[PDB]
Amino acid sequence: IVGGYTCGANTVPYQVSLNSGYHFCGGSLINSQWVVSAAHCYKSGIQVRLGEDNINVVEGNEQFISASKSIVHPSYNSETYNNDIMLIKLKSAASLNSRVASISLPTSCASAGTQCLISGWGNTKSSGTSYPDVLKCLKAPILSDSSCKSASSFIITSNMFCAGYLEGGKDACQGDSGGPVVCSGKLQGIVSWGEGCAQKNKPGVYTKVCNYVSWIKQTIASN
Numbered sequence: 001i002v003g004g005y006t007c008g009a010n011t012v013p014y015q016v017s018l019n020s021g022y023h024f025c026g027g028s029l030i031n032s033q034w035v036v037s038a039a040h041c042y043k044s045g046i047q048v049r050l051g052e053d054n055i056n057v058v059e060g061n062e063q064f065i066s067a068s069k070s071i072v073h074p075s076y077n078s079e080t081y082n083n084d085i086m087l088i089k090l091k092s093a094a095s096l097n098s099r100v101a102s103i104s105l106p107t108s109c110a111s112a113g114t115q116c117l118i119s120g121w122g123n124t125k126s127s128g129t130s131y132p133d134v135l136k137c138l139k140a141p142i143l144s145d146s147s148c149k150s151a152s153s154f155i156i157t158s159n160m161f162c163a164g165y166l167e168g169g170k171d172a173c174q175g176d177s178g179g180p181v182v183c184s185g186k187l188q189g190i191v192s193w194g195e196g197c198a199q200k201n202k203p204g205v206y207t208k209v210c211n212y213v214s215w216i217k218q219t220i221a222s223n
Ligand SMILES: O=C(C1CCN(c2ccncc2)CC1)N1CCN(S(=O)(=O)c2ccc3cc(Cl)ccc3c2)CC1
Pocket: 079, 080, 081, 154, 155, 171, 172, 173, 174, 175, 176, 177, 191, 192, 193, 194, 195, 196, 197, 198, 203, 204, 205, 206
């Protein structure tokens, strides 16, 4: 997160960290046994860390649970980033409380202008490199499809949406991938990709979760 602020310990109870010996991606707890993340974050031997704030210090509220099964969207295209979403089932159910809670799936897509909260442990500099140990937060508005497509050098599909600032300075970054974009108490997006970080005229591109609710529900119901 570039240009964001320290969220505050456990103020984002659904935020999870994907670990493979180190933090590499974010994710969202959608129920006691399932996590949603980005397909490009796929990797074998994933361990899900819940209730985290400082990812380098055990503070007492964490839950470390190995992934028993990962499911990349059937139509994920790594070349176009279309359908960049993945589901991860936990070997055992998480113990829900005030610091570990699930986020609701949306029943309708969010409209442009809506204010959303993006969070992650990603790089905090648009040029240099500096990874925080505590969770960073950022408030950002969903942009209109036209300005989104207009700003992007690549093709924006109907399964993506832009959020952020055209004036640069605030954006998600390397390490934030797979993380949540929550608006009005609903998970509306997944940190997917961008052309650099917080560059002027280059907003963040996110997976539009409202288009996958049916796939998500059917999948967890049958697995
Ligand atoms: O420009 C790129 C790729 C981004 C993905 N990509 C395409 C190509 C064709 N169609 C769609 C996407 C090819 C170029 N990168 C530079 C920025 N890095 S990053 O710093 O790790 C990064 C990762 C995720 C991000 C997510 C957001 Cl939401 C905003 C900035 C982000 C920046 C990722 C690769």
